[PDB]
Amino acid sequence: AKPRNLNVSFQGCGMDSLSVRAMDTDTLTQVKEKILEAFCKNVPYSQWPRAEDVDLEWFASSTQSYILRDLDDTSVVEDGRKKLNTLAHYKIPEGASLAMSLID
Amino acid sequence: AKPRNLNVSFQGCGMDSLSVRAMDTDTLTQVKEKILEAFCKNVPYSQWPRAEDVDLEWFASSTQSYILRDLDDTSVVEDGRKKLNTLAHYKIPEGASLAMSLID
Ligand SMILES: [As]
Ligand SMILES: [As]
Ligand SMILES: [As]
Ligand SMILES: [As]
């Protein structure tokens, strides 16, 4: 378990990508929080998108992208409860290209 | 009364400025709506900032900027009611540089 430096683009407008450091053990909500803190640092917090307002997609291949969520159908189920997905759960590599998107 | 092409920056992230056409007779809410439509075209409408979430500032001089609102203390008062400020009310020139900002 180590830190991961992610190259995140925020899709929808022509912003530059940002390098964001997250932890393998961060839940993907926490990963989103860190990304939003990085992108929205110069804006009042009352106006930031929330974790629930955005998807985070990992471009694993040219043809395969995986939407990274806390809970989904790849989540470990333990003693009758789902466990939260972490960055390490999806085996996200160092320098991975991620895209963040506002959703309906 | 004519159209005005405004050079609008959206401050807070490193987006390029956009040229936005507004009418002299547009209320500043309508001007904001047109600007948000231009900047947020590729994002779901449920996630756009609203007119009330942003200020629009006109850099009239190097040292003077005026926040452009529908109603303020420069508004014409007629028969006991304030009249909505328009783009023409502030005498905004063609090719004017404006900045839009998210507010608390
Ligand atoms: As955006
Ligand atoms: As932001
Ligand atoms: As912004
Ligand atoms: As937008």
Swiss-Prot record, chains A, B:
Subcellular location(s): the record lists:
Cell membrane; Cell projection, Lamellipodium membrane
Q: In which tissues is it expressed?
A: Detected at low levels in heart, placenta, lung, skeletal muscle, kidney, thymus and liver. Detected at very low levels in brain, colon, spleen, small intestine and peripheral blood leukocytes.
Q: Which family, according to the similarity comment?
A: Belongs to the plexin family.
Function per UniProt:
Cell surface receptor for SEMA4A and for class 3 semaphorins, such as SEMA3A, SEMA3C and SEMA3E. Plays an important role in cell-cell signaling, and in regulating the migration of a wide spectrum of cell types. Regulates the migration of thymocytes in the medulla. Regulates endothelial cell migration. Plays an important role in ensuring the specificity of synapse formation. Required for normal development of the heart and vasculature. Mediates anti-angiogenic signaling in response to SEMA3E.
- Which disease appears in this protein's record? Congenital heart defects, multiple types, 9: An autosomal recessive disorder characterized by congenital developmental abnormalities involving structures of the heart. CHTD9 features include common arterial trunk, tetralogy of Fallot, interrupted aortic arch, right aortic arch, ventricular hypoplasia, and hypoplastic left heart, as well as other vascular and valvular anomalies.
Subunit note = Interacts with NRP1 and SEMA4A. Interacts with SH3BP1; they dissociate upon SEMA3E binding to PLXND1 allowing SH3BP1 to transduce downstream signal through RAC1 inactivation.
Name this protein carries in UniProt: Plexin-D1
Q: Which organism is it from?
A: Homo sapiens
Question: What gene is behind this protein?
Answer: PLXND1
